[PDB]
């Protein structure tokens, strides 16, 4: 739920394990 991944996902995918794309920011929980 929170953008604490230090990653953006404009292309729609996150590479940081445990993080997922809440477009356009990677979020964890």
From Swiss-Prot:
PTM summary: Kalata-B1 is a cyclic peptide which occurs in three forms: with unmodified Trp-23, with Trp-23 oxidized to form oxindolylalanine and with Trp-23 oxidized to form N-formylkynurenine. Oxidation is enhanced by exposure to sunlight.
Record's keyword terms, sorted: Antibiotic, Antimicrobial, Cytolysis, Disulfide bond, Hemolysis, Knottin, Pharmaceutical, Plant defense, Signal
Domain of life: Eukaryota
Disulfide links within the chain: 5-19, 9-21, 14-26
Tissues with expression: Leaves and stems. Lower in roots.
BP GO terms, sorted: defense response to bacterium; killing of cells of another organism
Record carries keyword Transcription regulation: no
Cross-link (Cyclopeptide (Gly-Asn)): 1-29
Domain notes: The presence of a 'disulfide through disulfide knot' structurally defines this protein as a knottin.
Stated role: Probably participates in a plant defense mechanism. Has antibiotic activity. Has a diuretic effect. Has a uterotonic effect in humans. Active against the Gram-positive S.aureus with a minimum inhibition concentration of approximately 0.2 microM. Relatively ineffective against Gram-negative bacteria such as E.coli and P.aeruginosa. Inhibitory effect on the growth and development of larvae from H.punctigera. The unmodified form has hemolytic activity, the oxidized form lacks hemolytic activity. If the protein is linearized, hemolytic activity is lost.
Family to which the UniProt record says this protein belongs: Belongs to the cyclotide family. Moebius subfamily.
Protein name: Kalata-B1
Species for this entry: Oldenlandia affinis
Gene name of the record: OAK1
């Amino acid at each position: 739920g929170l953008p604490v991944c230090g990653e953006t996902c404009v292309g729609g995918t996150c590479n940081t394990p445990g993080c997922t794309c809440s477009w356009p920011a990677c979020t964890r929980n």
